[PDB]
Amino acid sequence: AKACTPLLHDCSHDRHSCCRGDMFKYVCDCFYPEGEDKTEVCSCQQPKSHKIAEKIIDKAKTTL
């Protein structure tokens, strides 16, 4: 496998196979995509800071 395991990609092959960066790396996360009774899916997910939009006091008629 030449290409690595970026975000939104399964990393069951290796919890530490997910691609890497200069600032922050990708963390493997497992979830039950409607298959908690069948099997769990583990993909690469990125961190957060509980802040995706905290500046919209003013209006704007244009795609942000």
Curated annotation (Swiss-Prot):
Residues 1-44 are annotated as: Knottin domain. GO terms for cellular component: extracellular region. Amidation at Leu-64 is not mandatory for activity on P2RX3. Residues 45-64 are annotated as: Linear cationic cytotoxin domain. It comes from the Eukaryota. Disulfide bonds join 4-19, 11-28, 18-44, 30-42. Expressed by the venom gland. It is found in: Secreted. GO terms for molecular function: calcium channel inhibitor activity; toxin activity. The modification Leucine amide is found at residue 64. InterPro entries: Spider_toxin_CSTX_knottin, Spider_toxin_CSTX_Knottin_CS. Keywords: Amidation, Calcium channel impairing toxin, Disulfide bond, Ion channel impairing toxin, Knottin, Neurotoxin, Secreted, Toxin. Enhances the high-affinity desensitization of human P2RX3 purinoceptors. At 50 nM, the toxin decreases the IC(50) for ambient ATP from 2.67 nM to 0.77 nM in human P2RX3. The toxin is composed of 2 domains: a highly rigid N-terminal inhibitor cystine knot (knottin) domain and a rather flexible C-terminal linear cationic cytotoxin domain that forms amphiphilic alpha-helices. Negative results: does not affect mouse P2RX2 or P2RX2/P2RX3 purinoceptors. The toxin (and its derivatives composed of N-terminal or C-terminal domains) are inactive against a number of bacterial strains. Belongs to the neurotoxin 19 (CSTX) family. 05 (U4-Lctx) subfamily. This is Purotoxin-2. It comes from Alopecosa marikovskyi.
